[PDB]
């Protein structure tokens, strides 16, 4: 087990459903011996002899640029085209639709409160679940 | 008559406006702005080249005679390019008046020293240099005055942290007072006190 930081505890990049890139900021530091998540993999890489070419948050985001350059355009929606192409590649898929009704995982406010790990560690969300249930 | 609001006077504000025009007509090469506050205090804002001539005229002129340098100090305003506002508060015993003369400076643009005009300024200019790092030309003895020997930085600059960077303790291994990076058992707690509602409509800035 390698204790990593939480989103409140690091400056991290997340991309929302629109594709907009935006960044968190450190509010508190990680507890105990936890470490920022990208520096554990960088610490791990040097022990194993395949050192990765980045030693600071700046250099890691420069590397994010090299991959997908819209992950450093913060708060920016980058327009995308070429949907027509994706469709033309989708008309060839020979798979067919089953007859199952489309039932979402969350039907009622009961299933809303506890989905991910942090939601499940919360004593306030447990009350909310117990509140609507009973 | 309002028993809670400060009496306003009338004549003094008119007198200091007349003298402010007087000073601006005579030193047009140096004066950049003249104003009188509602407290009734005259301010002359000069180009820094004009410091020595401006304080010399105000000291030796017969209808001025501002012979006492009440004090000299700087204000740090980082948003300005010339972030240091130098303020001279002068006193006229002949006319029982006061006057403020202000100029500006940056980090790399020293001001002339008025020690030739007011010996009182000698230590005041040492204090500006020490606390704000504003160098003065022609100072007889420009050196720190208030900070510890070999203190690095200018602690009254707005971007200098309140607790500083180093602290002292006695180290029994080396048998002397040593300097080390600052760590506080309790951090200074910053309070956000500003109210989000405007208190003075008279000072509202245009949103341009």
């Amino acid at each position: 087990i390698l204790p990593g930081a939480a989103y409140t505890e690091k400056s991290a990049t997340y991309v929302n459903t629109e594709g907009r890139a935006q960044q968190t900021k450190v509010a508190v530091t990680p507890p105990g011996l936890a470490r920022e998540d990208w520096k554990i993999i960088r610490a791990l890489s040097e022990i194993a002899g395949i050192t990765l070419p980045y030693d600071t948050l700046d250099q890691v985001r420069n590397r994010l640029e090299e991959v997908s350059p819209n992950l450093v355009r913060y708060d920016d929606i980058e327009e995308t085209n070429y949907f027509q192409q994706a469709s033309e590649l989708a008309k060839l898929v020979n798979q067919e639709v089953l007859a199952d009704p489309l039932v979402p995982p969350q039907l009622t406010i009961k299933d809303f409160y506890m989905t991910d790990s942090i939601s499940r560690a919360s004593q306030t969300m447990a009350k909310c679940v117990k509140a609507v249930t009973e | 008559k309002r028993p809670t609001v400060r009496p306003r006077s009338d004549v003094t504000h008119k007198q200091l406006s007349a003298f402010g025009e007087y000073v601006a007509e005579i030193l047009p090469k140096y004066v950049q702005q003249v104003q009188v506050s509602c407290l009734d205090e005259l301010e002359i804002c000069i180009h820094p080249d004009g410091v020595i001539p401006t304080l010399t005229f105000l000291r030796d002129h017969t209808n001025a005679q501002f012979k006492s340098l009440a004090d000299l100090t700087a204000v740090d305003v980082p948003t300005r390019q010339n972030r240091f506002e130098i303020v001279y508060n002068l006193l006229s015993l002949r006319f029982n008046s006061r006057i403020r003369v202000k100029t500006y400076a940056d980090e790399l643009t020293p001001i002339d020293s008025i020690v030739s005009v007011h010996i009182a300024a000698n230590w005041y200019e040492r204090e500006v240099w020490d606390m704000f790092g504003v160098f003065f030309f022609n100072h007889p003895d420009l050196r720190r005055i208030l900070t510890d020997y070999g203190f690095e930085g200018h602690p009254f600059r707005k971007d200098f942290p309140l607790t500083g960077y180093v602290e002292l303790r006695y180290d029994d291994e080396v048998k002397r007072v040593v300097a080390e990076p600052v760590e506080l058992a309790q951090e200074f707690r910053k309070f956000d006190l500003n109210s989000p509602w405007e208190a003075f409509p008279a000072y509202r800035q245009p949103p341009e």
Binding site: - | T147, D148, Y149, F151, P155, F160, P161, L162, T163, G164, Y165, E167, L168, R169, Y170, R176, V177, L184, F188
Partner: protein, 156 residues
């Protein structure tokens, strides 16, 4: 034993002489030193306890830190303390000396004189009233009274 008893009363004898003659070093820093002058004033007359101010650290027993200790003055305070012959005691008087006080967060202040010298008695207040300092001084005599140097030498 008899010798262990005699050592005890010899211990009280030497303590008593140090309790009864505390010579503080003429040395004050800021406003706390004004209240230290009031303790010397007629109403409290510390002299009546055998407390006499002596200017030279060689002739002084006690160093009362009565005011703020800045970084510029920190080495000098330590030097006059080192030059005090032993036994020697420090009374830290006031918030400034106790822990920085009103200037705890200043870049130029030592956050407590006990980072520089060992302190025996802490006297709270800003400033402590002359009686508060007097209570602290008399609390230092009781500390000396509890000294057990000779007895501990016997059991070595």
């Amino acid at each position: 034993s008899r010798a262990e008893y005699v050592v005890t009363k010899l211990d009280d004898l030497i303590n008593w002489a140090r309790r009864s003659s505390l010579w503080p070093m003429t040395f004050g820093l800021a406003c706390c030193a004004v209240e230290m002058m009031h303790m010397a004033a007629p109403r409290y007359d510390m002299d009546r306890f055998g407390v006499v101010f002596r200017a030279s650290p060689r002739q002084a027993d006690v160093m009362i830190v009565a005011g703020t200790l800045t970084n510029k003055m920190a080495p000098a305070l330590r030097k006059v303390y080192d030059q005090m012959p032993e036994p020697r005691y420090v009374v830290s008087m006031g918030s400034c000396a106790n822990g920085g006080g009103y200037y705890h967060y200043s870049y130029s202040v030592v956050r407590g004189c006990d980072r520089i010298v060992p302190v025996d008695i802490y006297v709270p207040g800003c400033p402590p009233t002359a009686e508060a300092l007097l209570y602290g001084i008399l609390q230092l005599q009781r500390k000396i009274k509890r000294e057990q140097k000779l007895k501990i030498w016997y059991r070595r």
